[PDB]
């Protein structure tokens, strides 16, 4: 109800990571289009790549090391030597599962409030010019070409430019 | 009535993740942080072969038991490979003493070098050589005897204290083994070194120690109510090691030479051993170490993954297939 | 100034680990009520009791394990024994701490994220048809009775049944 | 697009910890303000502290503890005690890393939503009787001197004195 | 004009809890993730009980300690208790060799059975075993000895090498214990066992090692001057012992037979012991073990919960009573 | 049109932080996590300076070495540094028993106290004491021997047997230290003890022990064939511990009486010692301990940071001075 899948047709569509992309869908006179937003997504792809490689590169701190023998009447040390063992087993096992099934609630939340933000950003550029309809859908209240709809999808919209139209067509369509 | 929507886009996919609040979410994409396979074989560290004891262990292999002859030496290894069958070591029932940091200090070898540190032919004039074998190590059907070390006897009833030692210019340490013998009953002292109240001593400058015959009765092992313990002691480069003795001594005959390793170990494994490269090798077969957890064995010798009792761990990455309840 | 707490009397309401719910407070002709949103309150129940389930089930590694005794000459041994002990006592305070105060600053926002996120879901569906007015409230510009409401708090909404009296009701009520 | 970097020359301002704060900046026929909210950059600053006391103080676990020595005939304990250095140093040193990194990405998150939490709060009193104009400003459909703009910074607002004036504009300002 | 207001609900509560960014926020519900309790019981683990040593310590109920004699024993158990008060162990002044690898070895065993390995009616018809007890080791008011070992001393003015075997017929391994004497003077030395210059020989297949008295003046303990050390020693299944000696054998009499476990340990706690059952057990009293963190005693027995330093750790799970800044 | 923004300030920074998400974000304020310098100096720990022996080991300082009586010594210590100049020790070629272990229980005391447990001068009427130096141990150009031990001679063509015990009347543990020869030929035994067939004994209520001459060939070492062990032993408060030999006792002349703390260690450090107090010291400097992680070194004493690897830790706190993606 805040968002929708962009019903692309299943693209080979964007760069890997992230498999997929935060974007639009329009409907004008000359026709429906569906464009991936570079700015928001690609920032995205950064990210995550950034955070997976700290998730790696930030453990390559081993150095040579192993595993021992004892004899019987070492029976003391070698289970000493499992306690370590079996100590670091259960220290790792614990935190590799927690820190990926936290950090993935984080990831999806993540995605979830780019696509988000960038709603925010659209209707920041609109105001008064659209109708906020459901669905994370704005209507215009002026017509809205290729041009303009490009001027949406990379942040230079001209507000000014079309609210006296806005302002008649909304004026009298709603209220 | 033109109209913009905002959302998202996600590409087919099976990935499948968890999260702390979901058990089985589609994501459309995921990076494996689990290392969860190996090669199967046991390949080079540090770029060098492990030593490969055959149908023997480090015992057979060091002292020179016979069956242990059928197999090579290289000048240098990171590991040791024990199989399950190196059933051959000690043939001759005894004890080694500290077998265990002998084990330890051997398994990264730079130098490898076997020598003859008192001859045979000329090192024993009074004693005799020629003599002193047994069922216990049997070689080709006969009575035999390690290759590395030597059964002194009397010569003909006598055994005249004997004292050789070596000096050790080589420019690394040498390893030097010996064995001292117990046998059962003051008859077979006397057969082979009549001298009742012998002993053996056997000095470095920085290793004092006597030993004496134990001689007792005992269960027969291999046939032999004797016994036999074997020694060792590292010999450092000026240093000069010196035995002395009046019966038992198992003389050294070939010595070893080597620089000792930062620090490897021995892995048991029936995998075969082949010419590739490992930063990390398990018993099972090597592994890839660029991921930062590994499931394979906790018993690992490199600069490993660490040992995690996980079974898959996906870090999503991607986008959800079915959208979250959160952005319906 | 975003949403309230629900002022019901303080029932025995909803089920464990939460222990409350995701709802609302109408008023209308008809007079007032309070309901809980199902799909919502369920939802995270369901979420914080995988997550508490997840802090105790990965740990479930433990084995037999124990504790040692030494000798007047092996001090060593027993000092390096307890090295291990101390050690691993440090780590599990620490991440056993960290990690519930951290996780607990998160289950707390989950909580007002749901809040939020549901009224922007009814945001969504009544649209012009409502006015915004402070404190997670929608004021009607329609006649809403209890059937009306019923749709309202279940997703099924009808904007354009309303939107002509809406708005009437608007362009002379507010503008 | 949301909200802006408040253009503050660059004062002293506030308390350290955060060295800075969350606030408005208006303008009026009076002249132009720059003022920092105090009860919400306050509540920032006593839970990041809070925060960087606990990722300190939660430690402070340490007990008299050392390091050890064994002979030539000891290479195995030597080893084990190594195996038992380095697996801490490698546990400590990812936990610590990745602590930090994760950590940090929530901090920084954590301003963010309190300036437009704040933005959220400032929507709430004014409603209809301003207009919402992209990158965290409102526009004020009626006469906002500097009392007002007071009430506003302090939650004290009070819409239904400019209601009816605000109306007038807005009927025939925008729409 | 109506209205409607989403909000959320929240029930009477006092539980608090703790976040980063708050000291003590009051949520509608938590779970606790500390175990802070015990039943303050010995209960059993692996549903086994673990063995009860009472007025005395695992020495002395190996060896036959008169005191210990008040006793029982089971076939079997999961870890064994001491307690504050089980001071009687080697009651004749000595040393327990390897006493401690023997403990570790004996926590968890599984089919206990003590037999009498050399009897005293007839294994020694030329040696005297009438005669031989001390005030060390009184029982009942009169000089004693262990009831497990058996003190050889000259029939009269003769201790004839004496050697005897055993070999090992049980399906299990068996225990062996023995000791050698060691006289405060040479005196005590003929009076005893007739025989200035004498030893004491053992030999299995896997253990071969020589005694002698150390014949040295020294204090009192529990009134003696003399000491003996007690040896042990696991015999294998098909091995055969054998004992040899002309003087200060302190034979044994009974041997044990048993299978050892895994890996348990021992617990010195002077709680009961109960017949309930536990995953986990610590020194106070047993402790659940479905939470995965624990804060009554890092020495713990069992699949148990780290031990934490942690007072209290709750994970909130309900919603805040008093409402959050961010929702105002 | 009155006009009102939301929005933040921040103040003018070069703090920079790392994120998961971001590499190099300047903030405007972060608190270092990271202990990462050292004042250069090894003060105090509890309170007490550390022990510092000068240009001689442990070794060297418990028996008298001659260089070593250059050294003061308090009656107490939180540690103990040797430096890389620490070279004299037991300057008579032989071995230390439980070395390693001595030196950790010595680490940290309490209340020392050097004293004279059998004087030179009346303790050996029957023997010699005043010959017996060696070139090995020389002071002052000339030959001589150990402050705290004394060795004993046959004072003419004799060596009867001797026997003398301490009884420790003093509050504390006595750590009495001796020795025994081994010359390297039965001349010199002769020489020397006239007793080829001699022994040494020594007795407490906790430790027995004999020890014979190992005579035997071997290097120089200083210039000395012969070699001699040194053994050590903790005496307890009402305990008596007994001395008894026919030849070789470098006998025990000065004991020591101490209290043992919990568990210091030794430290090698060319650093010099001061006057300030730590928490947590290390060997190239002490550390403040108020910080959770350090990375100068692992090795370390006191209740320290975790050694961590890290270069920098900065925990962000601050605003961003470019704002996020997300605000614009
Ligand atoms: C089994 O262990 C028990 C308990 O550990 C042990 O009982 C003790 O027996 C000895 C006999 O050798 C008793 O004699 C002691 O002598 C010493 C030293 O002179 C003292 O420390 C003791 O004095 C106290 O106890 C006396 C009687 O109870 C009192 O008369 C006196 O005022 C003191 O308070 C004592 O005289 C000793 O009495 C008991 N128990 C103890 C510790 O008091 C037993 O000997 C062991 N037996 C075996 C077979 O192992
Ligand atoms: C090298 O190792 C091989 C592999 O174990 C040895 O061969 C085996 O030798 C054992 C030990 O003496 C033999 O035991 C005997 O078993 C036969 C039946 O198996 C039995 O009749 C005898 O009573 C005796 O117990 C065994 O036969 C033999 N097995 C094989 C594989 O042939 C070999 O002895 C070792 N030699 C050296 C040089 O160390
Ligand atoms: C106390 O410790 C010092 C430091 O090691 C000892 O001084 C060193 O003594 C040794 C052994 O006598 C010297 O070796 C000799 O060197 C000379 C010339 O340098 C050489 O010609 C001789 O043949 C002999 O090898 C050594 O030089 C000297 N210092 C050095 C340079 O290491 C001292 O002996 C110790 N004394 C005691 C009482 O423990
Ligand atoms: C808030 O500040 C304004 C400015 O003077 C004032 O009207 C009001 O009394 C204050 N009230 C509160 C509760 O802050
Ligand atoms: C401990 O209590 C848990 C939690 O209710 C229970 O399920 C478990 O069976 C108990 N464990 C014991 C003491 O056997
Ligand atoms: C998650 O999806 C897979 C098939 O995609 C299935 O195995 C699993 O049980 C699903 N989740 C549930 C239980 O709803
Ligand atoms: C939480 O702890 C405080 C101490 O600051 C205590 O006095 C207070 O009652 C607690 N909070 C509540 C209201 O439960
Ligand atoms: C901001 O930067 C200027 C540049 O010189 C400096 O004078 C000013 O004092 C800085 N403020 C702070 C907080 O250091
Ligand atoms: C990170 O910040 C520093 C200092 O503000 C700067 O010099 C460096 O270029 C930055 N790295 C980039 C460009 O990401």
Not at chain 1, 105 to 112: I, S, W
Not at chain 2, 165 to 171: D, E, F, H, I
Not at chain 2, 278 to 287: E, N, R, V
Request: with cysteine; hydrophobic share 30%.
């Amino acid at each position: 109800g805040l968002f929708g899948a962009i019903a692309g047709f299943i693209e080979g569509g964007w760069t890997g990571m992230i498999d997929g992309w935060y974007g639009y869908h329009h409907q004008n006179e000359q026709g429906s289009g569906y464009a991936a937003d570079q700015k928001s997504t690609q920032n995205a792809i950064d990210g995550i790549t950034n955070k997976v490689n700290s998730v790696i590169e930030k453990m390559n701190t081993q150095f040579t090391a192993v595993g021992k023998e004892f004899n019987n009447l070492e029976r003391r040390i070698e289970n000493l030597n499992k306690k370590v063992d079996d100590g670091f087993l259960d220290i790792w096992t614990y935190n590799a599962e927690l820190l990926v099934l936290l950090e993935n609630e984080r990831t999806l939340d993540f995605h979830d409030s780019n696509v988000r933000n960038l709603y925010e950003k659209v209707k920041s550029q609109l105001k008064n010019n659209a109708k906020e309809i459901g669905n994370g859908c704005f209507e215009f209240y002026h017509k809205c070409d290729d041009a303009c709809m490009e001027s949406v999808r990379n942040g230079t919209y001209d507000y000014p430019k079309y609210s006296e139209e806005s302002k008649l067509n909304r004026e009298e369509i709603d209220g | 009535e033109d109209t913009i929507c905002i959302g998202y886009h996600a590409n087919n996919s099976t990935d499948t993740v968890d999260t702390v609040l979901e058990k089985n979410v589609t994501v459309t994409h995921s990076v494996n942080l689990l290392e969860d396979s190996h090669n199967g074989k046991l390949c080079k560290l540090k770029g060098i072969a492990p030593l490969q004891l055959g149908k023997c262990n480090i015992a057979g292999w060091l002292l020179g038991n016979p069956e242990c002859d059928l197999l090579l030496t290289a000048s240098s290894w990171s590991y040791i490979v024990e199989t399950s069958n190196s059933e051959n070591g000690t043939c001759y029932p005894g004890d080694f003493i500290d077998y265990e940091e002998l084990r330890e200090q051997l398994s990264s070898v730079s130098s490898f070098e076997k020598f003859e540190i008192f001859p045979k032919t000329s090192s024993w004039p009074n004693h005799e050589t020629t003599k002193g074998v047994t069922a216990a190590c049997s070689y080709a059907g006969a009575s035999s005897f390690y290759r590395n070390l030597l059964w002194l006897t009397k010569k003909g009833s006598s055994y005249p204290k004997l004292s050789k030692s070596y000096v050790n210019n080589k420019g690394k340490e040498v390893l030097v083994l010996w064995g001292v013998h117990h046998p059962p009953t003051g008859t077979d002292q006397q057969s082979l070194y009549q001298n009742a109240d012998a002993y053996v001593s056997v000095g470095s400058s920085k290793y004092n120690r006597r030993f004496t015959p134990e001689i007792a009765a005992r269960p027969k092992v291999r046939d032999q109510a004797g016994r036999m313990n074997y020694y060792w002691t590292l010999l450092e480069p000026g240093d000069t090691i010196t035995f002395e003795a009046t019966g038992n001594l198992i003389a050294p005959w070939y010595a070893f030479a080597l620089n000792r390793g930062s620090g490897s170990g021995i892995i048991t494994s029936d995998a075969p051993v082949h010419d590739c490269n490992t930063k990390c090798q398990t018993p099972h077969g090597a592994i890839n170490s660029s991921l930062p957890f590994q499931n394979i064995h906790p018993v690992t010798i490199g600069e490993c993954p660490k040992y995690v009792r996980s079974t898959k761990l996906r870090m999503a990455t991607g986008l959800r297939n079915i959208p979250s309840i959160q952005s319906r």
